[PDB]
Design a protein around this ligand. Sequence first.
Ligand SMILES: *[C@@H]1O[C@H](CO)[C@@H](O)[C@H](O)[C@H]1NC(C)=O
Ligand SMILES: *[C@@H]1O[C@H](CO)[C@@H](O)[C@H](O)[C@H]1NC(C)=O
Ligand SMILES: *[C@@H]1O[C@H](CO)[C@@H](O)[C@H](O)[C@H]1NC(C)=O
Lengths: 454, 454, 454
Amino acid sequence: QNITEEFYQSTCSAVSRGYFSALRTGWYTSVITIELSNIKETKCNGTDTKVKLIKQELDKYKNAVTELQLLMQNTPAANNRFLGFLLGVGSAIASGIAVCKVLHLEGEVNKIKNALLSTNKAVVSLSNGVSVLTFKVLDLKNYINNRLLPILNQQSCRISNIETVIEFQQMNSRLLEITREFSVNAGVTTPLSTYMLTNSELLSLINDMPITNDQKKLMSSNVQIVRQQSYSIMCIIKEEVLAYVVQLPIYGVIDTPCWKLHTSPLCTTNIKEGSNICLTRTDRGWYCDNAGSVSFFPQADTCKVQSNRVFCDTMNSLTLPSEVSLCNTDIFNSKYDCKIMTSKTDISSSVITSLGAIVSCYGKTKCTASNKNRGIIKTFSNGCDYVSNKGVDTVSVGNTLYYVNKLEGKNLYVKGEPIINYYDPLVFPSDEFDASISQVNEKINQSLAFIRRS
Amino acid sequence: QNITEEFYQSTCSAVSRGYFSALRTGWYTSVITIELSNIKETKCNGTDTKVKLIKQELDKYKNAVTELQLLMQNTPAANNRFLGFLLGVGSAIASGIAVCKVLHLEGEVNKIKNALLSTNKAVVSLSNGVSVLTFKVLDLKNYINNRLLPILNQQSCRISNIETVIEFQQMNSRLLEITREFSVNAGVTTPLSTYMLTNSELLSLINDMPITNDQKKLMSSNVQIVRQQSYSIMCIIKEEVLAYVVQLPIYGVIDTPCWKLHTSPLCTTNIKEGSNICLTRTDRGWYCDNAGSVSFFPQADTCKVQSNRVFCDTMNSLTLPSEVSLCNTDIFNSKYDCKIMTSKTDISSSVITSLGAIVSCYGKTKCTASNKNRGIIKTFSNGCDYVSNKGVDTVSVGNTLYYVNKLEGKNLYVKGEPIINYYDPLVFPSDEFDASISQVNEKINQSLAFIRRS
Amino acid sequence: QNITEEFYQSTCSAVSRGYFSALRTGWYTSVITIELSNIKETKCNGTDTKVKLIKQELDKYKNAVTELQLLMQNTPAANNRFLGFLLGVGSAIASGIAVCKVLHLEGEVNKIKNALLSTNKAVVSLSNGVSVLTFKVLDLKNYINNRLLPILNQQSCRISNIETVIEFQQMNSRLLEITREFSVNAGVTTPLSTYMLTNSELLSLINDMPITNDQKKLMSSNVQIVRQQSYSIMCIIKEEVLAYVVQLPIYGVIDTPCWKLHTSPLCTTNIKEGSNICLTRTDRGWYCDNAGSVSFFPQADTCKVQSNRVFCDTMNSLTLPSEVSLCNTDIFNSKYDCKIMTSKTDISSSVITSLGAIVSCYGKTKCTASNKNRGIIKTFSNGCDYVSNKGVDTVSVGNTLYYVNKLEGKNLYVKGEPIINYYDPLVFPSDEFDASISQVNEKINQSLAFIRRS
Ligand SMILES: *[C@@H]1O[C@H](CO)[C@@H](O)[C@H](O)[C@H]1NC(C)=O
Ligand SMILES: *[C@@H]1O[C@H](CO)[C@@H](O)[C@H](O)[C@H]1NC(C)=O
Ligand SMILES: *[C@@H]1O[C@H](CO)[C@@H](O)[C@H](O)[C@H]1NC(C)=O
């Protein structure tokens, strides 16, 4: 957890480095099953409370099976996924859906049923060429047919004991909650709950997945994050089996360097009303080296940071050439056309970084950094400035209070003239929402083609 | 499920056709009731476990009623709802809220109470002129007053049986979960859960709704989607009645043609850095014919597709003239000013379509389509291109893998010169976020007014 | 609830006034504890159902503790937060996280354990200088060790009674649900559920908070809204204690004037295709006076309105000078550069306001306001227009139906020439996504510098 952060005064941006990747590139699919009983009506006509109680619970079981059948008519299941508007589009659950489709082919559910006759965990080779870990997590068929129905049948049906009511409730419990979870999510859930897959089942699954021991260690040390990036997909009710697919991430990029880019608006600071111009670097977000290029995540919130490990889904990334990082040290470089937006919107704001805070202070806004016991320790002047988190608790910009992160690291302030000062405001192309350094230079040049004749 | 898709090479867009609409235009409101008991304290002072267990459960009932009362002080309930930023604004639950308001008028709850004295389902004519289907789904008044309180009262209060504890838990159960659901959603829930309305209640409701048998068949064949587009709204606790309103969709547009427009960026492909220009059709999303015009849904994710049926809420649409579809076959037509955005952002990306994939490949990005067993079957060259899903499993653009849909349909590739090539890059108005063909032509012409004197 | 609304025909905007603020400026943190038992294995080897039932429930307890331990390895917990893209960035849960960190220091959990030995509620002075209200809401240590384990131990372990199974289920219940809630939210939940903190605990907490009696009255009269703006943060499992932090809002701005600005597009109405220009005021949202300036909430949906009280979080605001409100009465004023976007997008739409509706009607769109019993009572002509909610039930724009709010107030229609008519369309800078009155004037002037030589 050796984090280093550099602030660039010239471009009102800061880069936090020292992070290591865990990027999801693949999917592991597993089939989870519950064995069901094919009983729709019992010939018990008693009146006492125990009788009604078993009937109520059997009604709950039967209405769960029916709800799961109505989830099946809304199948295929549905799910999908500053510069976020450019992201590509595809379904996040295509892999799971392909496995569900295979489970509909004659014999396939029966093959899984036979693999789990004598064990609750087995690898099965499906017809489409995937080997999947399959589980039987609950056997309501044996419980209803062999432990409950003999009580209700071979004797007067009122002769049960209140313990069997309570046991049947406990056996039905996990089925009703899986059904509930699927019913309010249209058969596709994320994060993966402990009712879809318990911790012991999930850790067992990870341990038997066709991945390296390092990947197994990563996933087992970060179970919650694995759950947040996993899906459960309702598949089929068929031949007295309920089957659903769990889709777990495979982190095909691990331990490459990652860095987070924070950006804020950089405006001129004249007092005259509406006389100021602005630019903001629009390439903020997470960056991870990946296979000769760089995976860029423009909605930074899509990545989950655990200490110095950054977990992201590659479906939330744009693939950029590695020269994009030159924008941090030389925004005018000729190898990559660095992205900016221009405006005359000089509204104050702050960004809390990994190890400090950037503050864009304009007009009359009060912008300060404080220590809870000592008072104000820094006051920001008009323009874009930075403070490390050392000795600081909070940053106030106008009426809003922000808390800095408490992590201790290394901070570097790179001094430089704000680049907004290099532009002639009479010819600056303001109000460009998605622009770049070259486009702006090109426009300035063109509109200095009139001033030529002068 | 006869889907047809056409790709237009000239404009980097594809249209999937063969879909049929189901658009929500109206709302059906129903009042769901639970009968409650007005008991706040029992004079039972025993010490054994059964006693405490009944007291705990009565405390749960009483705290549910209190939580429902605090939901009532946060009433009226609150809910609402590329070109999505233009959508109009209004409340999705105004109809339900109007019914809740009527339930507060003297006598109204009593009228419903009297309609349900002898039946659990009845149509009631409210004072505001709406006839609503009303339900009594749980009678905790009769259970507490007539089956539970005689046990706790007319005898020593320790003489209960553990069955009555379990029965009281089961009777209280649905009340506690409805209360829980409302409590973490500020009294307004969507999707409609099976605790708000069970499958049998919902199917009963649909069957008695004042709609045609075709609408009843649609809704009954697509219960999950109906639930996703329905609301439950907490209304009142009054005169020993809990009442909430369920608001179900009415699909007033059915079986008209719908088509989905996919678009991707179309840039020039010079090697020179920052020398390329781009345009993207901004009118992507779902389109359905509707009442002489066309309902356009710019956040395509707002529509739920079930096979070839497309379910959408008209509140998520813009109403356009039917000439908008000319943009697909003739983007330069003079009847509708086709919408585009311009830029110099030549970042690679892909869109998975209904029957294939569009790929915008720029710079050095590796863009390919593969079959899992055969390897790469297509490589995309710089520019905008398309592949059908026939014989294809996946599309890779840089570091991101996408899965194509597996549905088989008809695919047409319409060859044509990319229209970005028609523009002189020295005068192209780049970086226009919300533009159109005419605005761009108008700007080019103006800025060719200087080159005149030359 | 004296609301007044003014519509400005000149700028296609309306301002609803008469509201009073409740802005969250601070956070109150409280530590909630559950006492746990350190038992992982019982030497009971029986076979009957009661035995298994206790073992199942003990397994549930133990798997809850383990799940809470895996939530701890994904700690620090994670949470954060038209002109919304300008908002600053920081963590909403920094205060709670600082308290969690302190609970990890030697002796700190023990200090809380000793403060709650004889009471379930006490104020405790933590090592970092915060006094926190701490609660013990469940004592599973005493229940397992002193009421359950003697039954399973000092006698044959099959001698329990089914009541103790049911009592143990009821005692374990709240622990399992808190664990479930944390497990699918990565240890950070909002809204604050009744399992994290019951109504009686929450009202007790408010009553003992170091705030004024007016703040206590506000919070106690609006519990649901307090819950929606609160967080629960999983902290630690240590020394047989589960501890989590609840973070409640402190409304440091109360009863200052608030007003809501509604805006819609204002376009010219020529029949000629693609010949029209448009502008829209981009400063729509909620505004509250606050400390000499004005807190502006651009994603209006971030504020919760209860009658005439407006509850917002200052982290969702931009701090503006109070001259921003001049844009409502004089959009050309020289004290504040009023914000607009320009385009040629003349697509029809509506905004339902507090007391009426704005309608932007263009092209051939049918735009009307109706009364359910009387029919159409107003038809909107091309351009931007307004109707109050008096005698109106609904507004239709094309294919979409909107319901007006039913609240009765005062409505003022300020007549004035649409300002879009003042611009020469040949020189209007269209397609500016984030602009202002001055930038537009400046551009018009420059591009009238060519027409000079003429
Ligand atoms: C931490 O990492 C930075 C960057 O690699 C390096 O400069 C520094 O020497 C490292 N220090 C320690 C103590 O690991
Ligand atoms: C499918 O629909 C398309 C478009 O209407 C039509 O061209 C084609 O003939 C149809 N084919 C079948 C087999 O239905
Ligand atoms: C309501 O408030 C408005 C604005 O302050 C004021 O003009 C009016 O006189 C008030 N009327 C009543 C009845 O409170």
